[PDB]
Design a protein around this ligand. Sequence first.
Ligand code: ASP
Ligand code: ASP
Ligand code: ASP
Ligand code: ASP
Lengths: 325, 325, 325, 325
Amino acid sequence: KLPNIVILATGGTIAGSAATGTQTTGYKAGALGVDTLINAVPEVKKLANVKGEQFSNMASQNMTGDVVLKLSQRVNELLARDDVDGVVITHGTDTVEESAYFLHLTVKSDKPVVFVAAMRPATAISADGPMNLLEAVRVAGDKQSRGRGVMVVLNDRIGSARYITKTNASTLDTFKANEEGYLGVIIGNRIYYQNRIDKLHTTRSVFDVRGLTSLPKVDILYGYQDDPEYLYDAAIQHGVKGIVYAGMGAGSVSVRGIAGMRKAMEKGVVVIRSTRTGNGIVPPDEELPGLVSDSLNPAHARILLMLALTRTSDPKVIQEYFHTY
Amino acid sequence: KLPNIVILATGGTIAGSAATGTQTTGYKAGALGVDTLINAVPEVKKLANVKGEQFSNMASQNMTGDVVLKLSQRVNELLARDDVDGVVITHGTDTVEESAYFLHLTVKSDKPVVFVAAMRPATAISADGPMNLLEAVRVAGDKQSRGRGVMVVLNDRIGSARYITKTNASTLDTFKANEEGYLGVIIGNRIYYQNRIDKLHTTRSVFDVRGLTSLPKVDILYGYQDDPEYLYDAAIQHGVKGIVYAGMGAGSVSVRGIAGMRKAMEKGVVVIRSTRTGNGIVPPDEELPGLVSDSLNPAHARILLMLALTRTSDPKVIQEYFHTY
Amino acid sequence: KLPNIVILATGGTIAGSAATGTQTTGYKAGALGVDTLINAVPEVKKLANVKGEQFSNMASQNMTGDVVLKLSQRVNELLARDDVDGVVITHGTDTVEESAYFLHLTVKSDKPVVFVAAMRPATAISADGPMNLLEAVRVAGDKQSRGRGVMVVLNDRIGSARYITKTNASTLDTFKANEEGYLGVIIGNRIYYQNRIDKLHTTRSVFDVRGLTSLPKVDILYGYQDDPEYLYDAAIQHGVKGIVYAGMGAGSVSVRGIAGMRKAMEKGVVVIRSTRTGNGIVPPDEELPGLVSDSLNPAHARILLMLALTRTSDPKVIQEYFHTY
Amino acid sequence: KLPNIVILATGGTIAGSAATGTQTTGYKAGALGVDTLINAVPEVKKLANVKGEQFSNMASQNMTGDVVLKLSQRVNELLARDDVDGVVITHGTDTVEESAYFLHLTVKSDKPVVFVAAMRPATAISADGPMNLLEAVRVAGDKQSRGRGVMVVLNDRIGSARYITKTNASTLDTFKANEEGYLGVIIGNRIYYQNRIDKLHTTRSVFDVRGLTSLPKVDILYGYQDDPEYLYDAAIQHGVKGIVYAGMGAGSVSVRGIAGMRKAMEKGVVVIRSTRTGNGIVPPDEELPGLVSDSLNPAHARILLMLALTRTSDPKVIQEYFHTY
Ligand SMILES: N[C@@H](CC(=O)O)C(=O)O
Ligand SMILES: N[C@@H](CC(=O)O)C(=O)O
Ligand SMILES: N[C@@H](CC(=O)O)C(=O)O
Ligand SMILES: N[C@@H](CC(=O)O)C(=O)O
C-alpha cells in the first residue's frame, strides 16, 4: 500500500495561469483546478494514492478567518477517516503562515497536514509548484512525518507552522525561520528530519473550534516614528477584542501608543506587543501595557490571540499560551 | 594629526543605566550624558579629537519626524564647518533606521555621518555600546569613509542607512541587510570596505529640508487576513497625505484594502505598497492601486514618502524616487 | 536551593588576557585561570553553586583527540556524581564544535553539558565572555535543559553540538546553524526553548569511550579545481583509518580524487564524502566512491567517523550512523 | 535593437539530462549541447540576439586551471569584438566560483561576463536552469550591467565573483554572500542594482594571462584538531609554489601546522592563511607564519594566489593584492 493522501486546494499562485512563461502580473492566482495540478506531476502517483478536493480557489491575500475555520473543520473530518493517511493543502504564499498556524493549533490528529505553495505561477518558466507539490506529498505520506505539527513545504524545506514565515516579497527561497530553522529538508527524494518543535500543537493543543462559525475580531497596528493614537481609537470603536502591536524593536511603545493601549485595555481589549523586526523575543516588561508575544511575529500572534479569546479573557492564561504555543 | 569628530547624542539604550549588570527592563534609555559615554572609552581619544554635544536624551521609540528634522539641520551645520571631519550620532536601536535614512537623504556633505547604538545598556555585563562607539568613531574619522552615504555601525558591521534594518527584537547582531549586505566591517581595529550603495544619497540627493519646521503626515497600515477597511477611513479622516501599506507578500492587497486605497486616492492621499515580509522587491503592477516601494521596507518607505511630499505630489516622480533613492 | 555546576576550563580566548582593551593579537589564549573567570562575574553565584576546575589551558587550535577523550571521560565522572547537576566547559571558539560534538556522542547522562567560549579576550572592551559564561551557567542549571544533548552557548543563543558551527572568522555572532537553527535563546535572563534535535545523542548513543586511551587516525582533505591525488597517497602512507573529503558541492569528486579514494579503499581506509560549502546534505550516490556525510560538515564528520571506527568497520553501519547521529 | 550575447557553454548540471524528472544521480552533467539549452527557452530571443558556442562539456568538479586559462583567453577574444555586447557562460555549480573569480581578475573589458548554472538537471521537474539562463541573458544585455566585474546569476540573484560562494551542497538558493550581499536581483523581468563591489577587477586589474599556457601550482590544506604535518611535507615535495590554508577560525594554526608552514616558507612556498568557517576576515598577525586572505575563502584565495605568482614573489605585494582584489 501506498499512503492515501487528499490534496485539498484553496487557490494561490500555485494554481495561477498566465498568457506567457515569463509573465508574473495580470494572471489570476487560483485559476487552475486541483486535478490540473495533480496531472502536471503524474510522478505523484508513484508516491501516493492521491485524491483532489477543491476547497476554494482564491488568492491568499483574500483568505479570511471564517474560511480558515471551515478549512480546519474540513481537515479534521478528513483526518478522522481510516482511509486518509495525510492531507496536503495547496495555498497562496502571502498568508499561508496564518492559515497554517491556525490549523497547527486546531487540528486534532497526528496525521500529517502539509501546506504547500508556489512563488511562480504554474505556467512560468522554471515554475516551483510542481516540485513543491511532489515534496509535500512525499512528506505527507511518510510515517516519520507523524506528530510533528503542521508543516509548510517549499523549495526542498519543511518548516513548522509556528516558526516559518514569508521573509521576502518575491523570491523562491522566501520561507525561512531565521532563529529556529527547518524541521527538515527533502533532498534526492529523501526526507531528512532535523528538529522537533518544542511547543504545543495539534493533539496536545487545548484549542478546538469544531462547531464555531466565527472568531473574535483582532487587528494589527504598526509601530513607527510618529505612530498615531487615533488608530487605537478606531480599532476600539469598531469592536476589536484584541490588538496585536507590530512594535518598534522589542515591542517598544511610544507615548502615543501607550495612551492608545491604556484606552484599549480600559475597554477590555487584550493587547499583545509583538515586533515589526521579523524575528526574536519580545520579553516581559511589567512597566509597559499589554502582554508580550514571545517569538510570535504579528501575523502568528493575531491567530493565537483570536483562538485564545474563544476560550478565555484571562491575561495570565493568554500570556502562558504565548509562551507555550 | 587626528580627525575632529563630534559625537551628537540623542539617547537610546547606549545611554541607558540600570540598577544591576544583568538587568534589561525598568532602566531608562537615554539617562547618561554624552560625556559619560566618551569617558567610559578613553581609547577613543587615540582615534580622534572628540567633542560631545547633547542633542536630546530620549528612548528612540519616542523619536519624531519634527525632531529628526532638527537633527538633520544640526548635522548639516556641523558638517559645513572646517573644524568638523565627521559626526557620530548615538541613538536608540528601535528607530535608528528611520532617523538614519532621513539623514541619508537630507545631509549635504560627503563627510561621514555614522549612527551608533547598543542593544544592552551601558551598565550591562558585556555591554556592546563601548566597542560600538569606538568602531563608529574609527569609521567617522577615516578618509576612506567619505562619500558612502549615512552609516549605521554596530557589532563590527557598517550598514548603509538605505538597506540596514533591525531584524531581531533582542539580539546584539540584529542589524542586517539580508539581500544587500554590509558596506564594510571593522575587524582587528581595521576597516574593510566591501560595497558602495548604487543609489542616490547625500550630496547627489534632491531632498533639502533646511528651513522646514514640519513634514507631511504619513501613516503605516498592516496587511493581514481580515485586514479592515475602517483603518483607511480613519487615516483619511485624520488628514494623512500618505499611506505606506505593509503588505502581505509582494504588496498584495485584499478586497477590503483595495477599497480603502481607492478611497484614499480619491482624496489625493498617495499610497505606497511595501511588504511586511522584511526583505525584497515589491514589483510594479498597474492593476493594483498605489505606487510600489521597490526594496524599501515600510519604515524606510514612510521616510522617503514624507520627503517626496515636501517636493512634489506627482505619482510618476514619486515612483521614480522609490526606484533611485 | 541552587544547582551545583562545575565549570571545567580548557583555555581559549575566553581566558585570554592582553596588554590593552583594543588589543586582539600578541595576547595568549588560555592565560587566565578558571577562578579569575568566575570572579569576573560574581553574578553567577546567584544562579548556581559553581566550582571551577582547571582541565587544561590551551588555544583550541591545539586541542587534540587524545585530550578530548580525557575531557569526555572526566565529564562522565563528574556527571555520575550526585552532587553535580551540570557542567559548563570553557573552550576556544576555533574547535569548540569538534570537542562539543565528541562529547555529544560519548557523554552518558541527561545532565546538561554546555560549552561556552568568547570571540574577544577577557581584557577587551565589550568582552563577550562574561555574559556568555553567565548564560551558559543559567542553561546548565535549569531543569528544562536536561536531555537536550550537548550545547554551545554564545551571544544569547543555545546551539546543538550536532548542528552548530563557527560560520565567521572574526565576529561575535559567528556560531550559527543556518538550516537547523538554535535549540533555544536566552533573552532577559530567561531561557526560551525552540527545538529538540531529532538525532541520537548522549544517553541514547551507542558510543562509549570510557577506558579508551586513543582514537583512530582520520584526516580531512579538501576538494577544489586541480585537487591532487598525492595527498591521498600521503594519508594512506601515514596509516589513516579514515578520510573525510571536504568536497566540491554535494561531495563531488574530480578524476584525481576518485583515483585517490579508490586507492584508499583498497587499503581499507573508510572514506566519507562531505562538503566544503558550509551547509546541507550530501546525498547517497552508489556511482561514487565512499560513504556520505548526510548534513555533517567536515569537522563534525571526522569526529563521528573516529568514534564509529572504535566500534565497527562495517560501511553499512557507519553510513547509518551518519544518518542518525 | 537587441544586444548581441554569446552563450559560451562549459558543461554542468544545467546541461545535465536524466532518465526521469525526479532523478538526481546516474545522469551526466554536461550532456546537452548549448543549442539545446537555448532552444528550451525560446523567450531568450526577445531579450537578445544570442549565439551559442560550445567551449567544453564537463562536470565542473573536473574543471582545471589550464582550461580556465583558455576560457579567460577566449572570453577576452570575444569581448574585443564590436559585434559582442556580453557573454553568458554556462557552468557547473561546484566550482563556478573559482572559474568566475579567475575571469573577474583577468578579463580586460567592462562588457558583462555572467556565469550561470543550475542545481537541478534540465530534465528535472521544476528545473531551475531555464529561468537562470534567461536572467543571465537579461543581465548580460543590459547597459546598466557594464563595469560591475564578473557576475554569477542563479535564483533571481546577481552575485559578484569576488563574494559569491556555493554555501549549500544541494539547494537552489545555495549561492549567497552572507556579509556582502548581492550586487542585484532580477524580479518581474526587471533588474534592480543594489551595490557595486569596492575592489579591483577586470579593467582595473593588473593580472593578464593572455599568452600563458599554465599556472603556478597551489594546493589547499584543511585546519582541524590533530591536523598533520606530513601533508605540508607532501605538498612541498610535489613542487607547490603556494599553499592556501583553510584554517580553524581566523586562520589559526596548530603547532603542527606552524611547523609545516615554516618548512614550506624555507623552500620559498608562499603560504596564505584563510578560514574553513565560510565567511569573514582573517586579520594580519605578524607572529604567525604566512600572509592572510582578508575575506577571500580558500577556493578564491587559491585563484588569487596562482595569479599573483605569475607576476611576483614579493610577500608585501601579494599581501596588498589580497587586501585590494
Ligand atoms: N498572491 C498570491 C501569491 C503567491 O501565491 O505567491 C497568493 O498568496 O495567492
Ligand atoms: N528602546 C531602546 C532600545 C535600544 O536602544 O536598544 C531605544 O531604541 O532607545
Ligand atoms: N584561538 C582562540 C579563538 C577563540 O577562542 O575565540 C581559540 O580557539 O582558542
Ligand atoms: N556536478 C555539477 C553540479 C551542478 O552543476 O549543480 C557540476 O558542477 O558540474
